[PDB]
Amino acid sequence: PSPCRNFSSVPTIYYYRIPGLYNRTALDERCILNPRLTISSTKFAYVHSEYDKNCTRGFKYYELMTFGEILEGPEKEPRMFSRSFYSPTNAVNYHSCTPIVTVNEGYFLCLECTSSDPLYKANLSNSTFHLVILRHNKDEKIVSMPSFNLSTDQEYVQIIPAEGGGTAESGNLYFPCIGRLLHKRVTHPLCKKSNCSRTDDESCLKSYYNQGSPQHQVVNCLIRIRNAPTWDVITVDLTNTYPGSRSRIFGSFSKPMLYQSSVSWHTLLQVAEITDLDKYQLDWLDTPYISRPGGSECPFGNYCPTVCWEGTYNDVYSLTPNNDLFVTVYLKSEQVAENPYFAIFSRDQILKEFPLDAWISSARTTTISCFMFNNEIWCIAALEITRLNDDIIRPIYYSFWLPTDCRTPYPH
Amino acid sequence: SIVLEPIYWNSSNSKFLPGQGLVLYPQIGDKLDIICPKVDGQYEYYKVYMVDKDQADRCTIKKENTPLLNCAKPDQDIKFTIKFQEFSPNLWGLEFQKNKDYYIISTSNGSLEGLDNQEGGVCQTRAMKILMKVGQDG
Ligand SMILES: *[C@@H]1O[C@H](CO)[C@@H](O)[C@H](O)[C@H]1NC(C)=O
Ligand SMILES: *[C@@H]1O[C@H](CO)[C@@H](O)[C@H](O)[C@H]1NC(C)=O
Ligand SMILES: *[C@@H]1O[C@H](CO)[C@@H](O)[C@H](O)[C@H]1NC(C)=O
Ligand SMILES: *[C@@H]1O[C@H](CO)[C@@H](O)[C@H](O)[C@H]1NC(C)=O
Ligand SMILES: *[C@@H]1O[C@H](CO)[C@@H](O)[C@H](O)[C@H]1NC(C)=O
Ligand SMILES: [Cl-]
């Protein structure tokens, strides 16, 4: 059935908080960060990072990966259930695990590196990719690739997985990556067509460098793996991109899509149809006024070129084959990581939005996936939050029921 | 939302004390703006950075840093909002935890030509530094 686009007779969207995947004694003494989730139909692949109370300045217990199922909860809402969780030992050396889900396998592309800042403090010579493969009632498998051995279409200093998620198509896995180019191959970057200043083009080019990489351009790429085997890096179209950042390659009714977090002057929502996956070519979509909190230079809704490197990741999901109706959980704030809103929107207008629970003290990374469940349209979002003024740091999860009948949205 | 009185980042701000700069004890969850105000003397040019203790003590910055504020627009107010908590949009480790100390300085000298100066500047000549003793009891 077709999703409703008109919410005049839909004062409330029905949504339900669903439990996390495990509970433990003294879970409040753990700092759980960086939720990554991809759902396809009835299966999901999920990963998060578990630390002591000091978060990334303390010990990392787990890079915790799981392949699970969507099942009914007590109020007929879809819930995530998993029985088996997996982690490397010495979790601090495993970074940026990026999930793909299929009906029979959960896949995670991780980077092993001794540095805490692998993109900027390590290179191909001292990094190794690991593809973790999870299956129901079977042993985990790990397939590895020293970074030096990866076939690349451009020369890179370093490449890391881009975290938000990937997709399986044409018998291959496609994971987003971020790389630092050896040479200055971005020469005519995408910039604002109607310039705000005489130096916009300069700003647009300079935006590809940052404090971590002052001399090498930071760009989006993808890692394609076949027979998960052969591994290839494909660089994004360098005339049609934005500075490399945490991203997700996702499916919209079997066609590939990109969400790219906005770290640059271009603070507005960055979502594209991927028009040729094996050449990583894009058609960027129009959006309404949906952005992310930033800093003083590139706060929410900045649209003129300048040089900055800031922002949160808050991804989207399409409810239609035509990619004209989307959901997100975005942060309605100029500069602070707080105030998450669920929003339903077309390319032109925010159609309905509302704040989530008032007891959320802060929120940073958010991710959302939608699926058919009991012949109904549902979305699950994972929010990286804190509660009780940073006393309790771990993600929460919501299930949203999206109506198909604009007159009578919710039966019974 | 608890909003602490904003810090105006300019040379006439008497809250920057000799030998000590500006010391405060923000609690987790508090909000505080640092503001470079527009023109009504002349506009004062600054890049304002978060730094470690050593750098604040020596009024010295290294290239591997990104301004919290780039005060280089005479025609408009520029505001940076801090919420004292773990999470923010900053991608270079801005993060606040209880019982830890944090530092903000500028080594700019106030003129356009001294904007990118790495040593001294108003941190030294005006004690324009902020010490934030987060989650602490003074
Ligand atoms: C949405 O539905 C309401 C109630 O039927 C109606 O007033 C409005 O014109 C509709 N908007 C459209 C079709 O754009
Ligand atoms: C976290 O850091 C604090 C202060 O730096 C320290 O006292 C404490 O031991 C750390 N927490 C642990 C090891 O759980
Ligand atoms: C990786 O190698 C580079 C030089 O080739 C070195 O500077 C860097 O520190 C190394 N990183 C790690 C994590 O070993
Ligand atoms: C756009 O750039 C052109 C070429 O430098 C310049 O002539 C024009 O004034 C600029 N427009 C602005 C700043 O609005
Ligand atoms: C600021 O520093 C610049 C560069 O060293 C210098 O040219 C300028 O005169 C200085 N201005 C002062 C101290 O007012
Ligand atoms: Cl570099």
XYZ file of C-alpha atoms and ligand atoms in Angstrom:
621
model
C 0.000 0.000 0.000
C 0.939 3.654 -0.701
C 2.113 5.903 2.216
C -0.049 8.862 3.216
C 1.352 12.279 2.148
C -1.313 14.521 3.730
C -1.452 14.783 7.539
C -4.382 17.231 7.998
C -6.435 14.350 9.468
C -3.400 12.726 11.177
C -2.772 14.765 14.343
C -0.544 12.038 15.835
C 1.990 9.612 14.403
C 1.947 6.417 16.482
C 5.383 5.482 17.765
C 6.752 3.221 20.466
C 10.043 3.040 22.335
C 11.445 -0.478 21.941
C 14.042 -2.101 24.204
C 17.752 -2.271 23.501
C 19.258 -5.595 22.417
C 20.583 -6.532 25.864
C 20.482 -5.446 29.483
C 23.125 -5.981 32.167
C 23.932 -5.056 35.753
C 25.708 -1.687 35.901
C 24.858 -0.852 32.290
C 24.757 2.776 33.538
C 28.529 2.350 34.255
C 29.074 1.793 30.518
C 29.217 4.491 27.828
C 27.606 2.998 24.668
C 28.152 4.987 21.496
C 27.889 5.091 17.765
C 24.836 2.957 16.857
C 24.817 1.714 13.232
C 21.754 -0.045 11.885
C 20.466 -1.407 8.586
C 17.163 -3.267 8.250
C 16.043 -5.191 5.187
C 12.547 -6.720 5.471
C 12.600 -9.019 8.552
C 16.405 -8.987 9.275
C 18.814 -6.397 10.680
C 22.556 -5.864 11.112
C 23.598 -3.671 14.007
C 26.799 -2.488 15.629
C 27.739 -0.203 18.513
C 30.826 0.541 20.634
C 30.869 -0.071 24.391
C 33.274 1.790 26.677
C 33.797 2.401 30.376
C 32.298 5.581 31.917
C 34.943 7.776 30.277
C 33.623 7.020 26.792
C 36.293 7.311 24.080
C 38.835 8.588 26.638
C 38.482 5.271 28.483
C 38.643 1.551 27.798
C 36.675 0.023 24.922
C 35.127 -3.283 25.978
C 33.398 -4.224 22.678
C 32.949 -3.396 19.012
C 29.657 -5.191 19.307
C 28.122 -6.680 16.141
C 24.891 -8.605 15.695
C 22.626 -10.062 12.995
C 19.045 -10.298 14.236
C 15.355 -10.398 13.347
C 12.349 -8.104 13.473
C 9.529 -9.643 15.568
C 6.202 -8.497 17.080
C 6.151 -6.755 20.464
C 3.290 -6.595 23.040
C 1.479 -3.698 21.287
C 1.907 -5.271 17.785
C 4.895 -2.976 17.081
C 8.005 -4.377 15.385
C 10.938 -5.024 17.721
C 14.570 -5.986 17.247
C 15.637 -9.333 18.652
C 19.050 -10.934 18.599
C 20.424 -13.903 20.545
C 24.114 -13.757 19.538
C 26.541 -10.853 19.710
C 30.065 -10.740 18.510
C 33.178 -8.642 19.203
C 36.863 -8.641 18.477
C 39.218 -8.924 21.413
C 41.265 -5.705 21.892
C 38.266 -3.781 20.566
C 40.207 -0.492 20.680
C 42.072 -1.581 17.538
C 38.872 -2.206 15.505
C 37.271 0.885 13.993
C 34.300 2.107 12.007
C 32.522 -1.242 11.553
C 29.967 -0.632 8.780
C 26.932 -2.927 8.436
C 25.150 -4.586 5.456
C 22.202 -6.902 5.983
C 20.804 -9.641 3.689
C 18.185 -12.344 4.357
C 20.849 -14.922 5.397
C 23.938 -12.887 6.347
C 24.904 -9.850 8.405
C 28.103 -8.236 7.119
C 30.391 -5.725 8.841
C 33.362 -3.982 7.248
C 35.801 -2.917 9.974
C 39.314 -1.421 9.903
C 42.030 -2.755 12.198
C 44.608 -0.157 13.145
C 46.510 0.590 16.402
C 45.856 4.349 16.118
C 42.784 5.899 17.721
C 42.426 8.268 14.701
C 43.009 5.876 11.763
C 41.965 8.165 8.900
C 44.476 10.856 9.893
C 47.185 9.033 11.911
C 47.614 5.788 9.922
C 47.946 4.852 6.273
C 47.486 1.847 3.968
C 50.787 0.292 5.140
C 49.625 -0.147 8.764
C 45.893 -0.846 8.389
C 43.896 -3.982 7.591
C 40.271 -4.373 6.556
C 38.179 -7.132 8.087
C 34.836 -8.297 6.729
C 32.866 -10.001 9.518
C 30.141 -12.379 8.343
C 27.413 -13.424 10.771
C 24.886 -16.210 10.046
C 21.985 -17.713 12.021
C 23.094 -20.694 14.246
C 26.558 -20.803 12.608
C 30.071 -19.685 13.421
C 31.161 -16.187 12.488
C 33.539 -15.928 9.537
C 36.193 -13.195 9.027
C 37.655 -12.322 5.604
C 40.640 -9.933 5.668
C 42.466 -7.583 3.345
C 45.617 -5.616 4.193
C 44.871 -2.047 3.070
C 48.036 -1.987 0.926
C 46.581 -4.840 -1.196
C 43.274 -3.102 -2.072
C 42.837 -2.244 -5.751
C 42.028 1.481 -6.002
C 40.899 3.724 -8.906
C 42.819 6.704 -7.422
C 45.967 6.867 -5.295
C 45.094 7.056 -1.560
C 47.100 7.794 1.548
C 44.448 6.181 3.783
C 40.921 4.780 3.535
C 38.402 4.005 6.283
C 34.870 2.567 6.322
C 32.231 5.320 6.546
C 30.039 3.659 9.180
C 26.402 4.446 8.382
C 25.809 1.300 6.318
C 26.103 -0.335 2.925
C 24.050 -2.414 0.495
C 24.279 -5.694 -1.414
C 23.572 -5.568 -5.212
C 24.754 -7.401 -8.396
C 26.259 -10.195 -6.240
C 28.514 -7.612 -4.511
C 28.747 -5.775 -1.219
C 29.052 -1.976 -1.415
C 30.362 -0.215 1.678
C 30.865 3.525 1.854
C 34.374 4.699 2.712
C 36.257 7.939 3.351
C 39.725 8.413 1.891
C 42.557 10.880 1.815
C 43.823 11.321 -1.773
C 47.554 11.270 -2.472
C 47.170 13.890 -5.218
C 44.854 16.902 -5.628
C 42.291 15.235 -7.886
C 39.400 17.473 -6.768
C 39.898 20.394 -9.191
C 36.351 21.670 -9.950
C 34.259 20.831 -6.900
C 30.528 21.232 -6.667
C 29.821 24.688 -5.263
C 26.914 27.105 -4.975
C 25.790 28.102 -8.504
C 24.677 31.595 -7.528
C 27.792 32.692 -5.596
C 27.493 34.582 -2.300
C 31.009 36.058 -2.578
C 33.873 36.498 -5.028
C 35.823 33.681 -3.302
C 33.152 30.916 -3.153
C 35.034 28.569 -5.486
C 38.191 28.911 -3.352
C 36.180 28.055 -0.229
C 34.571 25.088 -1.956
C 38.002 23.670 -2.834
C 39.627 24.432 0.537
C 36.721 22.618 2.217
C 38.301 19.283 1.200
C 41.219 19.811 3.640
C 41.031 19.914 7.403
C 43.157 20.005 10.565
C 43.682 16.226 10.326
C 44.555 16.312 6.646
C 45.861 19.791 5.739
C 47.624 18.621 2.544
C 45.436 15.768 1.281
C 41.874 15.993 0.004
C 39.252 14.075 1.981
C 36.627 12.387 -0.226
C 33.847 9.832 -0.320
C 34.552 6.425 -1.830
C 33.082 2.956 -1.832
C 34.558 -0.494 -1.338
C 32.996 -3.137 -3.594
C 33.571 -6.762 -2.559
C 32.619 -9.655 -4.819
C 32.444 -13.354 -3.914
C 32.532 -12.531 -0.183
C 36.885 -12.702 -3.203
C 37.775 -9.448 -5.039
C 37.978 -5.972 -3.422
C 37.945 -2.610 -5.272
C 37.804 1.043 -4.180
C 35.680 3.325 -6.362
C 36.010 7.080 -5.849
C 32.927 9.301 -5.905
C 32.441 11.642 -8.873
C 34.816 14.412 -7.782
C 32.880 17.064 -9.777
C 29.625 16.210 -7.949
C 30.412 15.647 -4.286
C 31.008 17.235 -0.929
C 33.918 16.779 1.512
C 34.257 13.160 2.588
C 32.242 12.224 5.663
C 30.238 9.634 7.591
C 27.749 8.270 5.042
C 25.426 5.462 4.175
C 24.697 3.627 0.953
C 21.127 2.331 1.258
C 18.364 0.813 -0.868
C 15.169 2.408 -2.072
C 13.049 -0.299 -3.720
C 16.142 -2.066 -5.073
C 17.977 1.064 -6.307
C 21.067 2.472 -4.512
C 20.919 5.746 -2.594
C 23.478 7.888 -0.747
C 23.071 9.811 2.493
C 26.203 11.909 3.243
C 26.495 13.804 6.543
C 27.180 17.507 5.977
C 30.540 18.551 7.444
C 31.027 21.563 5.199
C 29.501 24.949 4.408
C 26.803 22.959 2.615
C 24.894 22.199 5.806
C 21.630 21.241 4.116
C 20.600 17.598 3.814
C 22.693 15.621 1.319
C 20.761 12.749 -0.245
C 21.287 11.337 -3.749
C 20.152 8.665 -6.097
C 23.251 6.667 -7.040
C 22.789 6.595 -10.828
C 25.811 4.390 -11.529
C 27.073 2.465 -8.516
C 30.211 1.075 -10.169
C 31.276 4.618 -11.176
C 29.813 6.132 -7.969
C 27.915 8.789 -9.916
C 25.112 10.743 -8.240
C 21.897 12.695 -8.771
C 21.504 14.927 -5.692
C 17.928 15.452 -4.567
C 16.170 18.680 -3.614
C 15.138 18.876 0.038
C 13.221 21.111 2.411
C 14.922 22.989 5.299
C 16.457 19.959 7.034
C 20.025 20.354 8.265
C 22.110 19.600 11.408
C 23.635 21.572 14.261
C 27.151 22.861 13.610
C 29.521 25.426 15.100
C 29.827 29.167 14.736
C 31.008 29.007 11.124
C 28.533 26.413 9.720
C 25.492 26.279 11.958
C 22.189 24.648 10.955
C 21.005 26.028 7.630
C 24.200 27.749 6.453
C 24.146 27.804 2.654
C 26.991 30.127 1.557
C 30.465 28.706 0.880
C 33.046 28.970 3.613
C 35.599 26.596 5.233
C 34.589 24.465 8.199
C 34.596 20.836 9.351
C 31.678 20.223 11.708
C 28.281 18.599 12.062
C 26.348 15.510 13.098
C 25.116 12.462 11.160
C 21.347 12.094 10.941
C 20.373 9.853 8.019
C 17.143 9.344 6.080
C 15.050 6.670 4.457
C 12.728 6.808 1.406
C 9.158 5.572 1.700
C 8.515 5.581 -2.095
C 10.175 4.208 -5.287
C 10.149 7.746 -6.722
C 12.106 9.088 -3.694
C 9.643 11.844 -3.061
C 8.753 10.968 0.528
C 11.284 10.455 3.325
C 11.645 10.037 7.058
C 14.433 11.209 9.372
C 15.245 11.931 12.970
C 17.090 15.270 12.787
C 18.461 17.637 15.439
C 16.503 20.882 15.469
C 19.294 23.037 16.873
C 21.728 25.611 15.541
C 24.868 24.426 17.347
C 24.000 21.946 20.118
C 23.667 18.176 19.991
C 20.086 18.056 21.296
C 16.379 18.305 20.401
C 15.733 15.352 18.067
C 12.656 15.598 15.811
C 11.038 12.856 13.760
C 10.082 14.288 10.348
C 8.175 13.078 7.261
C 9.015 15.136 4.181
C 8.836 15.445 0.429
C 11.606 17.026 -1.656
C 9.827 20.408 -1.205
C 8.134 20.418 2.209
C 8.278 19.071 5.751
C 4.828 17.389 5.882
C 4.780 16.489 9.573
C 7.314 16.680 12.407
C 7.423 16.521 16.200
C 9.967 16.413 19.044
C 10.725 13.040 20.616
C 10.802 12.343 24.405
C 11.511 15.384 26.615
C 13.755 13.291 28.898
C 16.411 12.976 26.130
C 19.228 15.183 27.511
C 21.287 15.074 24.306
C 21.380 13.349 20.944
C 24.044 13.118 18.279
C 24.126 10.329 15.652
C 20.748 9.096 14.458
C 19.797 6.472 11.864
C 16.523 5.181 10.460
C 15.379 2.245 8.299
C 11.892 1.320 7.053
C 10.287 -1.929 6.047
C 6.985 -3.750 5.525
C 5.730 -5.486 8.692
C 2.278 -7.176 8.925
C 1.351 -5.415 5.661
C 1.990 -2.030 7.376
C 4.720 0.559 6.814
C 7.076 0.861 9.793
C 10.386 2.579 10.492
C 12.894 1.876 13.277
C 15.287 4.625 14.386
C 18.391 4.257 16.582
C 19.388 7.446 18.479
C 22.756 8.003 20.101
C 21.644 9.805 23.264
C 22.296 10.657 26.851
C 19.820 10.792 29.758
C 20.015 12.339 33.202
C 22.644 14.996 32.225
C 25.211 12.513 30.840
C 24.755 10.010 33.729
C 23.326 7.425 31.279
C 24.969 7.235 27.839
C 23.540 4.584 25.523
C 21.255 4.470 22.485
C 17.457 4.364 22.439
C 15.261 2.881 19.741
C 11.822 3.830 18.370
C 9.314 2.143 16.037
C 7.188 4.491 13.910
C 3.960 3.378 12.257
C 3.395 5.308 9.045
C -0.212 5.452 7.831
C -1.416 4.540 4.318
C -4.969 5.940 4.741
C -5.006 9.734 5.271
C -8.674 9.733 6.460
C -8.489 6.824 8.932
C -4.726 6.431 9.662
C -4.864 3.884 12.538
C -7.551 1.111 12.682
C -8.938 -0.378 15.943
C 17.798 24.857 29.687
C 20.287 26.781 32.026
C 21.932 29.645 30.180
C 25.059 31.195 31.671
C 25.754 34.875 31.032
C 27.614 35.125 27.711
C 31.292 35.944 27.312
C 31.943 38.861 24.953
C 35.256 38.116 23.312
C 36.767 41.598 23.233
C 39.568 43.569 24.867
C 37.291 45.727 27.062
C 35.863 42.703 28.915
C 36.918 43.205 32.527
C 36.095 39.541 33.352
C 39.568 38.595 31.976
C 41.643 39.095 35.166
C 45.373 39.816 35.314
C 47.444 36.671 35.590
C 44.301 34.428 35.656
C 42.015 35.236 32.715
C 38.375 34.185 33.071
C 37.770 31.200 35.401
C 34.354 29.535 35.723
C 32.773 26.374 37.113
C 30.131 25.318 34.634
C 27.993 22.276 35.467
C 27.132 19.514 33.026
C 24.149 20.612 30.975
C 24.850 24.361 31.304
C 24.919 26.478 28.109
C 27.283 29.384 27.435
C 27.761 31.629 24.424
C 31.033 33.226 23.403
C 30.246 36.255 21.207
C 32.280 38.466 18.898
C 29.943 41.455 18.568
C 29.574 43.603 15.428
C 30.678 47.260 15.193
C 28.501 49.938 16.936
C 36.928 51.653 18.861
C 37.594 49.478 15.806
C 36.457 45.879 15.232
C 38.784 43.402 16.866
C 39.836 40.412 14.774
C 40.311 37.032 16.552
C 40.547 33.319 16.011
C 39.464 31.654 19.248
C 40.513 28.059 19.942
C 40.114 25.278 22.450
C 43.578 24.188 23.610
C 45.228 22.000 26.255
C 46.664 23.303 29.577
C 50.219 23.531 28.262
C 49.219 25.713 25.317
C 47.026 27.979 27.457
C 49.882 28.392 29.999
C 52.283 29.354 27.224
C 49.786 31.308 25.066
C 50.876 29.211 22.105
C 48.773 27.343 19.474
C 49.786 24.720 16.923
C 48.521 24.467 13.325
C 46.551 21.273 14.126
C 43.510 23.087 15.441
C 40.304 24.616 14.084
C 38.793 27.841 15.417
C 35.738 27.710 17.643
C 35.223 31.320 16.503
C 36.642 33.149 13.495
C 35.880 36.752 14.371
C 36.497 38.368 11.010
C 33.143 39.928 10.127
C 32.712 43.554 11.299
C 29.137 43.688 9.935
C 27.646 40.811 11.950
C 27.565 39.243 15.405
C 29.298 35.865 15.539
C 28.237 33.489 18.327
C 29.545 30.119 19.448
C 27.270 28.134 21.801
C 28.805 25.610 24.228
C 26.678 23.048 25.996
C 28.797 21.434 28.677
C 28.253 17.786 27.857
C 29.764 14.817 26.021
C 28.009 15.329 22.681
C 28.357 18.125 20.172
C 28.736 18.769 16.434
C 32.457 19.362 16.907
C 34.410 16.646 15.127
C 37.870 17.337 16.723
C 37.290 16.167 20.300
C 35.378 19.036 21.959
C 33.763 17.147 24.781
C 33.145 17.921 28.427
C 33.146 15.589 31.413
C 32.752 16.333 35.118
C 35.879 17.005 37.227
C 38.006 18.013 34.248
C 39.428 21.356 33.213
C 39.246 22.923 29.765
C 40.876 25.937 28.080
C 40.013 28.503 25.411
C 42.485 31.139 24.166
C 43.277 33.453 21.278
C 46.833 34.241 20.197
C 45.532 36.733 17.608
C 46.626 40.337 18.400
C 43.299 41.996 17.443
C 44.337 43.348 14.015
C 43.483 41.753 10.680
C 47.192 41.195 9.942
C 47.761 39.381 13.278
C 44.706 37.123 12.947
C 46.749 33.926 12.373
C 49.471 34.623 14.940
C 50.439 31.477 16.843
C 52.161 32.917 19.932
C 51.248 35.534 22.495
C 48.551 37.871 21.265
C 45.650 38.761 23.533
C 46.050 35.566 25.549
C 49.317 37.169 26.754
C 48.720 40.910 26.463
C 45.124 40.904 27.818
C 44.847 37.603 29.687
C 42.132 36.622 27.175
C 41.869 33.011 28.188
C 39.048 30.980 29.667
C 39.479 28.196 32.189
C 36.394 25.994 32.549
C 36.436 23.800 35.657
C 33.588 21.562 34.620
C 31.300 19.897 37.129
C 33.376 21.186 39.994
C 32.704 22.933 43.293
C 34.798 26.148 43.574
C -5.133 17.467 2.524
O -6.353 16.974 3.089
C -7.179 17.997 3.661
C -8.415 17.342 4.268
O -9.053 16.518 3.284
C -7.549 19.050 2.611
O -8.158 20.169 3.267
C -6.328 19.524 1.817
O -6.758 20.288 0.686
C -5.488 18.345 1.335
N -4.263 18.811 0.698
C -3.814 18.459 -0.520
C -4.599 17.497 -1.372
O -2.766 18.923 -0.939
C 37.803 7.919 34.176
O 38.620 9.081 34.314
C 38.677 9.558 35.665
C 39.316 10.950 35.699
O 40.295 11.084 34.661
C 39.425 8.513 36.496
O 39.463 8.933 37.868
C 38.750 7.135 36.395
O 39.614 6.125 36.937
C 38.372 6.738 34.961
N 37.357 5.686 34.977
C 37.547 4.355 34.955
C 38.926 3.746 34.925
O 36.570 3.622 34.972
C 51.565 4.303 9.916
O 52.708 4.629 9.112
C 53.024 6.029 9.045
C 54.228 6.280 8.132
O 54.281 5.330 7.058
C 53.314 6.544 10.454
O 53.657 7.936 10.433
C 52.104 6.316 11.345
O 52.397 6.756 12.678
C 51.762 4.833 11.343
N 50.567 4.611 12.143
C 50.424 3.553 12.945
C 49.126 3.486 13.692
O 51.281 2.686 13.067
C 30.171 36.187 -7.985
O 31.487 36.051 -8.537
C 31.743 36.934 -9.637
C 33.124 36.596 -10.182
O 34.115 36.861 -9.181
C 31.628 38.389 -9.176
O 31.756 39.253 -10.313
C 30.305 38.637 -8.461
O 30.287 39.922 -7.829
C 30.056 37.575 -7.393
N 28.725 37.729 -6.835
C 28.406 37.980 -5.568
C 29.506 38.119 -4.600
O 27.242 38.100 -5.184
C 49.774 41.903 14.786
O 50.700 40.985 14.191
C 50.992 41.289 12.823
C 51.853 40.168 12.252
O 52.993 39.948 13.085
C 51.653 42.670 12.734
O 51.900 43.046 11.373
C 50.741 43.707 13.382
O 51.371 44.992 13.354
C 50.419 43.295 14.818
N 49.543 44.287 15.439
C 49.558 44.707 16.719
C 50.546 44.174 17.719
O 48.747 45.542 17.085
Cl 47.941 15.874 5.331
